[PDB]
Amino acid sequence: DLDKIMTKMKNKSVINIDDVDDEELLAILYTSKQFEKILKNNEDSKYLENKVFCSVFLEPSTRTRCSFDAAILKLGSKVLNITDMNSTSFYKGETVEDAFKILSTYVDGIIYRDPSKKNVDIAVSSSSKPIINAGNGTGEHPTQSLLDFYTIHNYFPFILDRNINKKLNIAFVGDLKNGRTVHSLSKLLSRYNVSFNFVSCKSLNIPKDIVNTITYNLKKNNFYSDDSIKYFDNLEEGLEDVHIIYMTRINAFILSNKTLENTRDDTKILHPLPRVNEIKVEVDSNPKSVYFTQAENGLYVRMALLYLIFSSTSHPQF
Amino acid sequence: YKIDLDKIMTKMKNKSVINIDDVDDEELLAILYTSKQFEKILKNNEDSKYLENKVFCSVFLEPSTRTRCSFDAAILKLGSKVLNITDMNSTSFYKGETVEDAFKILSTYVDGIIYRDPSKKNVDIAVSSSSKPIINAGNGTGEHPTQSLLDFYTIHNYFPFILDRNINKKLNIAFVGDLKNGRTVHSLSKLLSRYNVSFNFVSCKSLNIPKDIVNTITYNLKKNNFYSDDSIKYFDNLEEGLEDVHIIYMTRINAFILSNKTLENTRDDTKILHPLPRVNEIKVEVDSNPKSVYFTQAENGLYVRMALLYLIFSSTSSAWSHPQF
Amino acid sequence: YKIDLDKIMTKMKNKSVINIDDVDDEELLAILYTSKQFEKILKNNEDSKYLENKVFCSVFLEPSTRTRCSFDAAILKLGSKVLNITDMNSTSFYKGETVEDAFKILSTYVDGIIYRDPSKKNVDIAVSSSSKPIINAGNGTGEHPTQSLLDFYTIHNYFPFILDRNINKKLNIAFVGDLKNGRTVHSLSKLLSRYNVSFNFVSCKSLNIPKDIVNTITYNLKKNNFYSDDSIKYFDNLEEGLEDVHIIYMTRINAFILSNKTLENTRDDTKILHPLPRVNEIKVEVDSNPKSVYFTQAENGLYVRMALLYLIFSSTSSAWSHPQ
């Protein structure tokens, strides 16, 4: 019931993946799929006109910012940008709370990216208007996990089912300590019937509190066992029986066509981007690679999220 | 409300607005009326699109994010479009090119230009060269007309009688802080002194109101028969300067820190304004005090700027197409 | 006017435009015809919204405010929308990322891309990686096709006969100043030489027109039987170089300063162009002279850019939807 879920999400701020529940997630997924079909069929995408947004980016993060802008513009709304400023140049001497108390009166909603975790929370408290977090220093990046989850769900729809007999097996590879995109998505995936392969060198292992959160979430739905979380030193073992391979930003963990020969046929490769050397260019020709479709999906998911949160009204329907 | 919005619009059509003196009595009434409409329309979540199909250029040659965001929002809420030139200082833009060339050209691409530049010289050269209207969004000589318009609009919301020029209804305003450098005070004083208004200048001796501003105020009060010896008063401290004042206006920059304690012996109806940002001048405790209106003041800039753009740049006025609640 | 705007549009649909050589005879007539419609529409304060619902990315990896503003204005006047990546140099954008990844991705969010980058390499890599059309707004090798298009459009307003390829109606143009580094001259020469044109290159010895440009002009003039020994002429000074020229084109940078005195012995009909900005290559007194058109030239960029975007990105047709 897309009406009901909208009434609940209307004017919601979205800071953290935990701010999205089961229903909200289904809504976001459903809506994202509609925007996807609409856009790929070159149909009218203007489901959210007459809104004016402010996009505040206090660190260089061009892709996420371009992607939200595009999402706003394709919806038919408008955006004012604060860009290419760091956290002190904006807030010349002014309090965060003043800056957002005021700014919030000029626009319908605010997209905020700031390395300071503190500032986003203060923003949420001061702002009379909804805020979407586009990334902060504690590694909260909800739209990134939403688009990651969306991508996985396109290939492995059964992840929604919470069916004891349909388990998804994911390998997370690389810098698991600093890869906050892993932490976020893990948190979301562990709400479902999922098994985790953490492939990493010892100093870049998944943090304990993330393992606890996963264990907690898997226990809550009766999907935790001794085989739920597994830890690997190398690719050949870690990649074994995994539906999804997720590579992190940063060696020993370089993805090639050779290292992919002993994966499942159905396995799909994701990477939040940009890649450097983590994935060899040869792999872009391999139909297992979906990281460019993954990046593309961020548009549909962000359109979806803005639509559900800010419509004051008609829903997208193919 | 009182007046012929069509006629005033024919007069304002394609007006540049550089200085508060560019706005007359009628124009002001128009701006006030229209600002009010945009306020109600926006607060009732109604369609704000009274000025579509316009393309603007916004040229900001100093960091002034709040004013720049507020004009952008105003343009976008009106349903028009904007190109930005931003985060550049005066020499990087005008790499070697003359100001007159830059604007002669820029002016052929767009319907109107919003210009902020520390150089007072440049804004004037812009006005001469541009084939298109220019709204000054602030320059070095302290001309900032939309700031005084929004200030006045705010005051008028609490004290509508200021418009009357009634010998018995006098508004008493205290301007507090750096009166020398506070160009927002100079501008707004110039506007206020067109009406029945009395001025308390609260300052330390080296940051006093300048003489030529006192002369302008005196000149404007005399012209409407509202000047007396009690019209302008000068204070050393808050307790005296705040005494019987409808409005307290705090300046950007100590001894003049506003607190709940210092506000106990003001009038009940007094309203507090500050152009912003504050740094210390007002204690955060004051935000809870219903006398504080500095956040509503900042908010009002949207409605006033929407108003000003609407009146200046509408090409397809008829009496029925105007905003009306 | 003369030609099938529908057909030319089907051909130009989703065309990238990197170089003046990417525009052919028909494409050119189309652009000229459409540019003229946008000119009349805009000057009569009519509805200019011939291309709504598009979203563009404008990527400018060097300061070039006037071109960038002119494209933005063109997009916005058309009724479309634009996201800007601006005031960044080539390495800050592409933090470490490959050009091909950046454009592969970016290209999935928007309908088209306007790209300015001092690196010639990057614009080509962009074109290969992008799933979407790209208009080059200027690069290091001096490819700037919308600048030549607007230059040519300006010339054609005063001297329409350049389109004709008529053996008896030859246009005589003087190019003046830094011919070595003035890439705008190189591009425009290349275009002009497709027609019945004669060239006066006015320059000091170290800033002469490059040989490979002279060869291209020669080659193009020969192909249409317009090459003779009088086709390309080289001058030391203004008085000789300005003699019987319909167009004077001044370049950015002395001995070659344009004044009302130096303009006395030109033709009555001669028109003065400059890509801009000037910095006293042209005395301000000349702005009052009706021979000066460099401000109209700059103005024309809006109409030409609106024209180019319209022809490339409108999907699709239609007989009744065209500007007229």
CSV table of C-alpha atoms in Angstrom, one decimal, chain B residues 49 52-57 79-88 92-98 100-102 104-106 108-111 132 315, chain C residues 45 47 49 63 65-70 72-73 75-77 79-81 86-87 252 276-279 284 287 294-295 298-303 305:
chain,number,residue,atom,x,y,z
B,49,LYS,CA,5.0,30.0,-9.8
B,52,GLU,CA,8.2,31.5,-15.1
B,53,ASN,CA,10.3,31.4,-18.3
B,54,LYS,CA,12.8,33.9,-17.0
B,55,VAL,CA,16.5,33.1,-17.0
B,56,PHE,CA,18.7,34.9,-14.6
B,57,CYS,CA,22.4,35.2,-14.0
B,79,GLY,CA,9.5,29.0,-11.5
B,80,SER,CA,12.3,30.7,-13.3
B,81,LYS,CA,15.9,29.6,-13.9
B,82,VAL,CA,19.3,30.7,-12.8
B,83,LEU,CA,23.0,30.5,-13.9
B,84,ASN,CA,25.5,31.0,-11.2
B,85,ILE,CA,28.9,32.7,-11.2
B,86,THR,CA,30.2,32.0,-7.7
B,87,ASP,CA,33.2,31.6,-5.4
B,88,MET,CA,35.3,34.0,-7.6
B,92,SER,CA,39.6,36.1,-11.4
B,93,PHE,CA,36.3,37.0,-13.1
B,94,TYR,CA,37.4,40.0,-15.4
B,95,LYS,CA,40.6,38.0,-16.1
B,96,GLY,CA,41.7,41.1,-18.0
B,97,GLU,CA,38.4,42.2,-19.5
B,98,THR,CA,36.6,45.5,-18.8
B,100,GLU,CA,31.6,47.2,-19.2
B,101,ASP,CA,32.4,44.5,-21.9
B,102,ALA,CA,31.7,41.7,-19.5
B,104,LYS,CA,27.5,44.3,-22.2
B,105,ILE,CA,27.9,40.7,-23.3
B,106,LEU,CA,26.5,38.8,-20.3
B,108,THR,CA,22.4,39.6,-24.0
B,109,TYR,CA,22.1,36.0,-22.7
B,110,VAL,CA,19.8,36.6,-19.7
B,111,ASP,CA,16.7,38.5,-18.5
B,132,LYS,CA,19.2,44.4,-18.6
B,315,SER,CA,6.2,40.9,-18.7
C,45,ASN,CA,10.2,37.9,-26.6
C,47,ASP,CA,8.4,31.3,-26.2
C,49,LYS,CA,11.1,26.4,-25.1
C,63,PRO,CA,38.0,28.7,-16.2
C,65,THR,CA,33.0,31.6,-17.9
C,66,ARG,CA,31.6,33.2,-21.1
C,67,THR,CA,31.3,29.9,-23.1
C,68,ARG,CA,30.0,28.1,-20.1
C,69,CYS,CA,27.4,30.8,-19.3
C,70,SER,CA,26.4,30.8,-22.9
C,72,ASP,CA,23.9,27.2,-19.6
C,73,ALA,CA,21.7,30.0,-21.0
C,75,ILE,CA,20.0,25.0,-22.2
C,76,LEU,CA,17.9,27.0,-19.8
C,77,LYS,CA,16.2,29.1,-22.5
C,79,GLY,CA,13.6,24.8,-21.2
C,80,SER,CA,15.9,22.0,-20.2
C,81,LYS,CA,18.1,21.6,-17.1
C,86,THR,CA,32.9,23.9,-12.6
C,87,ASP,CA,36.1,25.7,-11.3
C,252,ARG,CA,43.4,37.8,-28.6
C,276,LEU,CA,36.7,38.1,-27.1
C,277,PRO,CA,37.7,39.2,-24.7
C,278,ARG,CA,39.5,42.1,-26.2
C,279,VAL,CA,42.3,43.8,-24.2
C,284,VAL,CA,36.8,51.5,-27.4
C,287,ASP,CA,32.4,50.1,-30.6
C,294,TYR,CA,32.0,41.6,-32.1
C,295,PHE,CA,29.2,42.1,-29.4
C,298,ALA,CA,29.1,37.1,-28.8
C,299,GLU,CA,25.3,37.5,-28.6
C,300,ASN,CA,25.0,35.0,-31.6
C,301,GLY,CA,26.6,32.2,-29.6
C,302,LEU,CA,23.4,31.8,-27.6
C,303,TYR,CA,21.2,31.2,-30.8
C,305,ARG,CA,24.2,26.9,-29.2
